[PDB]
């Protein structure tokens, strides 16, 4: 059952510019209100020599506020769950891919991810750890042959105020056949903070039709 207070355990293996790392952590949130808060720790390869923000959107569209009148592909995928694949193309030529499987154990969600980043400029804002936070965004969600496609133009706010642009494209694939929504959008607000060792993420997400 999907709880009003739903927990997640996270495991990520990844590399950025050939630097391998591992992240583990926990989350809690209200999936029906599209709210979640995460506590993440670097367990291998820390301190990360890159801005954590390029990883944060990898750490679950179940935590989206969907109206009753719109099909919720992600909540309908439960308890079987779903997986997703994502490409992230930065305007400076840097590229990243992410792969995630979302499933359940007795305590809540199990979130297992991989992340491969390369060709971020060595003296760019990401390797110099100048990321602050992503801007709020609007992701277009489009059905296509059993899976959903997501398309969102992202802007990472840097120290000093300039913005690094990247195009995110995601495919979302339920582990069973589920009824699928029409084209719509999801409005995101993802905020990163820090508590000593712990990297903290909070996301709010709401689904809406266009117009």
């Amino acid at each position: 059952v999907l709880k009003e207070n739903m927990k997640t355990t996270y495991h990520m293996d990844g590399s950025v510019n050939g630097h391998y790392f591992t992240i583990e952590g926990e989350g809690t949130g209200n999936p029906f209100k599209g709210q979640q808060s995460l506590k993440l720790r670097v367990t291998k390869g820390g301190p990360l020599p890159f801005a954590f923000d390029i990883l944060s959107p990898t750490f679950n569209r179940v935590f989206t506020d969907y109206p009753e009148y719109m099909p919720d592909y992600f909540k309908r995928s439960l308890p079987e769950g779903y997986s997703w694949e994502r490409t992230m193309m930065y305007e400076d030529g840097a590229t990243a891919t992410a792969s995630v499987r979302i499933s359940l154990d007795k305590n809540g969600f199990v979130h297992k991810s991989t992340f491969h980043g390369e060709n971020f400029p060595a003296n760019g804002p990401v390797m110099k750890k100048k990321g602050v936070n992503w801007e709020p965004s609007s992701e277009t969600i489009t059905p296509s042959d059993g899976i959903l496609k997501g398309d969102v133009t992202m802007f990472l706010v840097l120290e000093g105020g300039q913005r690094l642009k990247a195009l995110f494209q995601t495919t979302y694939k339920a582990n069973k056949v589920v009824k699928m929504p029409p084209r719509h959008k999801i409005e995101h607000r993802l905020v990163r903070s820090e508590d000593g060792e712990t990297i903290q993420l909070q996301e709010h997400a709401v689904a809406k039709y266009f117009t």
Side-chain angles (χ1 to χ4, degrees), residues 88-104:
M88 296 153 281
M89 308 286 151
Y90 289 75
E91 58 177 336
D92 56 5
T95 64
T97 57
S99 186
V100 167
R101 294 168 292 149
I102 289 164
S103 58
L104 298 170

Side-chain angles (χ1 to χ4, degrees), residues 31-47:
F32 308 99
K33 293 175 181 175
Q35 175 273 324
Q36 62 186 319
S37 303
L38 287 65
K39 293 161 65 172
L40 305 174
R41 301 166 307 275
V42 180
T43 58
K44 186 265 288 278

Side-chain angles (χ1 to χ4, degrees), residues 1 27 40 50-51 54 87-88 104 125 133 142 147-148 164 170 172 189 192 208:
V1 64
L40 305 174
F50 55 85
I54 65 172
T87 61
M88 296 153 281
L104 298 170
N133 265 313
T142 307
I147 53 95
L148 298 188
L164 184 73
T170 315
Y172 305 95
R189 194 170 47 82
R192 179 176 63 88
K208 296 174 176 176

Side-chain angles (χ1 to χ4, degrees), residues 73-86:
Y73 186 84
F74 309 99
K75 293 189 183 72
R76 287 177 178 181
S77 83
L78 308 182
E80 286 72 16
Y82 73 104
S83 64
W84 59 258
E85 321 292 329
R86 176 174 297 162

